[PDB]
Amino acid sequence: AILDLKSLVMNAINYWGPKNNNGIQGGDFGYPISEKQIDTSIITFTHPRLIPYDLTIPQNLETIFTTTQVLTNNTDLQQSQTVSFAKKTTTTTSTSTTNGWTEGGKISDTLEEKVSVSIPFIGEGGGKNSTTIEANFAHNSSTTTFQQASTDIEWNISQPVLVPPSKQVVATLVIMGGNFTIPMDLMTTIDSTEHYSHYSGYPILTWISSPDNSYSGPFMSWYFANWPNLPSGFGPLNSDNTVTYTGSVVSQVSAGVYATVRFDQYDIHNLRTIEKTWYARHATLHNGKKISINNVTEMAPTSPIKTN
Amino acid sequence: AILDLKSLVMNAINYWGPKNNNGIQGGDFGYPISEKQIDTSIITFTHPRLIPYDLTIPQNLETIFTTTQVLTNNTDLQQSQTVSFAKKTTTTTSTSTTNGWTEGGKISDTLEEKVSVSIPFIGEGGGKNSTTIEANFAHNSSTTTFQQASTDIEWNISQPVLVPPSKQVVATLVIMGGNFTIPMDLMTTIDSTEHYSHYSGYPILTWISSPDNSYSGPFMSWYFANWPNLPSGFGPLNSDNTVTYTGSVVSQVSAGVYATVRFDQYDIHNLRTIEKTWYARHATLHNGKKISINNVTEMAPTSPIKTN
């Protein structure tokens, strides 16, 4: 859920109050306190670290783009022609918080960063492969509301094709992509714009004002970290006197994963019939790398004998 | 357990054999094959990555070292005397494999590296703290046998002490340490010293010799990665045609975590009775950092009022 830090601070203050006065020397804060004696706006959250869980179970892809180039040789000699595709697609991510935080119900500003994520995938023959994908992720620790982000990828596939005389070669670019749900831990460090240092530094999560408002006293992170019902997601006191909270996001990513080119040869005088179909030797991944076409089609690799 | 890769390769070869001859073109390998037709010694394991799980549940410490320095002022004036401790201790780790690998029962050579590990700990008042510890870890992917390593740490604690006339101040260094069980995933990449490339590169896990031994054929990682009973710990085929295996270690670490100094004041003419006990303002961590003494003793921090 979205934890309110103002409430928890108020719960901690009201727990320590009658027992040690929150370490404040003197004063009549009238416990329990009302949310007017308090201003938690001085609390800072470190910009969150996003830790993707690395997907392990291979997924099925489907065709998200197909296009064609036509190469013709109506000459007397074998020609060397290059097939060149350049296609921009857009990887899309939408992200909701499962376990987030705010301070006094506030809604913070959506942030956006690049995250490397593991993408295990199933080639067309059912072959199993492993790659990584870099994408833009938007997140908001303060709502469950989905935050969208987008990333532009260009697929550049170029290679030479050997076209015989009076043949037509048709090159078909196919882009395979899928839909992945990546859960990520979301990591933040609770600090403050103000400290009660003096012997060593302690973030002040809130000054506690007297009911008449004349004087005040500081509420230090020490009392928050050692509060016996501090929730499960808060870490212990760091060397810093800061406290780490670890929340959660669930992200959904929709990305092209790999591209192949298929060649189909025809004789220019009957274009109804394929003479010869073959694949480019390499499929191209989202991240630009080249892998063997056997990893993603129904052909197994193959070798002759070696007679020593 | 310790998986033998020679067996699994042999199981894969004997699975594919009758079906496609392991992609080898021609030849009568007599399936099933015996372990003489095969030499898996060409298989390489990438030097393992060790991924520590970050301990979350705070632990109790005990006193692993205590020593004293005695400061005396038998002069007429307040003196400024520095107390200086330099103590070498040794962090010890012992590590056994839960899920490891070898090739044909071989026992590889124990390796040793520095790993940063999370150490949550309970101060003397029951306060909860978070630090990190860098230690040497020895591991062997091929046995369950414990591998020990050791790391030398110096504790340097120096500060000035204010000693009144005709007082004795006794400074007591206390080092608190504990015993932590860190489980770690162990990560390796199966490659080969030999490749059947030719269209793209495939590690050869083993040449398969004819029964008469005249000729042979290569067994490529493709057949291993797509073998329907490949075990659960192997990842899919990487872009590299390598296969990632992820095993496990369980490590036990015994380390000092923090040091404090307590001062006890006496009058030099009765040394049976403490006048005044107080702490150095800071405890010192294993990694050299300084944290407030309140995080690790039974004293809560404290502030006066501020009258605006």
Numbering used by the authors:
A (entry chain A), B (entry chain A): 2 to 309
Copied sentences from the primary study:
Previously, we described the isolation of one such crystal protein, designated Cry51Aa2, with activity towards the hemipteran pests L. hesperus and L. lineolaris. The structure reveals an elongated predominantly β-stranded structure with similarities to other bacterial β pore-forming proteins. The structure of Cry51Aa2 closely resembles that of Cry51Aa1, which is expected as these two proteins have high sequence homology (97.7% identity).
Crystal 1 was used to solve the structure by SeMet multi-wavelength anomalous dispersion (MAD) phasing methods. Cry51Aa2 protein crystallizes in tetragonal crystal lattices (a,b=55–56 Å, c=209–210 Å, all angles 90°) and in the P43212 space group. Recently, the structure of the closely related Cry51Aa1 (1.65 Å) protein was published. A super-positioning alignment of Cry51Aa1 onto the SeMet-Cry51Aa2-L11M structure coordinates conducted using the align program in PyMOL revealed that the structures have a pair-wise root mean square difference in α-carbon positions of 0.57 Å (using 291 α-carbon pairs). Also, Cry51Aa1 and Cry51Aa2 proteins crystallize in nearly identical tetragonal crystal lattices and in the identical space group. Substitutions at positions 93, 95, 147, 149 and 251 reside on adjacent antiparallel β-strands in the region adjacent to the putative amphipathic pore-forming loop (residues 112–140) and define a second region within the Cry51Aa2 structure impacting insecticidal activity. Surface-exposed side-chain substitutions in residues engaged in antiparallel β-sheets, as is the case here, should not impact the lateral hydrogen bonds which stabilize the β-sheet, but could impact other processes such as protein oligomerization or pore formation. Finally, the R273W substitution resulting in increased Lygus activity (for example, Cry51Aa2.834_15 in Table 1) is located in the tail region of the molecule and may promote interactions with the target cell membrane due to increased hydrophobicity at that position.
